[PDB]
Every structure is written in structure tokens, then in C-alpha cells.
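Inputs:
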Amino acid sequence: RSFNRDRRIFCAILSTHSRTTGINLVEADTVVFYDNDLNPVMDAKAQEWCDRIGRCKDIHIYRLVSGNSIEEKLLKNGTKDLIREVAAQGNDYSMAFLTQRTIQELFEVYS
Amino acid sequence: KKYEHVLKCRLSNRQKALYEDVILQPGTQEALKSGHFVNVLSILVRLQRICNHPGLVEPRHP
């Protein structure tokens, strides 16, 4: 509310693991996603709340990525699907859901 | 209205050094060759935390 009422505070810095995305009004007109979130429930709630802000008025959303790092690979929905696959009965298995090809080819540098 | 932007940022030399150190450690290479979900997850919770800012993995002490 302080950030909404006062037009001088340039940016509100916000954590994806916060809970009160139930607040419908945020006055600022851009969002920067500094990082990806490995946990997909937090990621989904963060995106959904940012799209709610975008519905309230036009915004620019910004996604930063390191060019050569693994973060480009986490951008793909398949990595989230990997975590989703491991989420089912991830206690009694051998923790070998990540196949060797998937691990190596997800990170390996190619021309 | 919604406009999507993805911006590529070049990692610094200190970030490159810590990144190559974590990758080339044998404890990472063995996990890559053999495979284990918790080990790869820990490798990423290291490497991406480096990738955000190397001060979270080794802060500059006074």
C-alpha cells in the first residue's frame, strides 16, 4: 500500500516465495524476473500473479538469463516436467529418474 | 496487454571461475556420469546460486 500511494519509490523488491499474491492491486507497470524458480508451484503462483497485474493494466515483464549457463536449460518446461516426474513417490525409488542422456545432453555444449 | 522479453546476460570472470570450479570438481563429474536426482539438484542449487551472484557462494570479506 505504501508503494502504491507514493509515486516516488522506484521499485518494490518481491520474493517468489511470498504468500500474499491475493493482493489484486499493485500500481507499478513493469516486472523483472531476476531468476528462475526450480520449484514449479512457486513459479506458477508467481507467473499467475504477474499475469493478474498485467490484466489490471498493461505491463512489461522482463526475464533475465545467463547466456552460457544452465539457466538457459531451466527455461525449458521439460526441466520442470523432470522435477514433476520425480515428485511422484520420490522416496522409495533409487533416485535415478534423471537418465544419463537427459543429464548429459541438457548441459553439454554443442556447435 | 503483455509483452515478453528474455535478455541474455554475460557472466563475469569471477562467475566464470566459480562456475568452472563447481563443474570441474570430480564430485560433479561422477554425478554426471552415474546420475542421482538429489545430487543433480544440489549441483544446480550451487551453480544457479553462483549464476545469480557469486557473493552468495563466496562473499568478499573486509
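The radius of gyration of chain A is 18 Å. Flag for discussion at group meeting.
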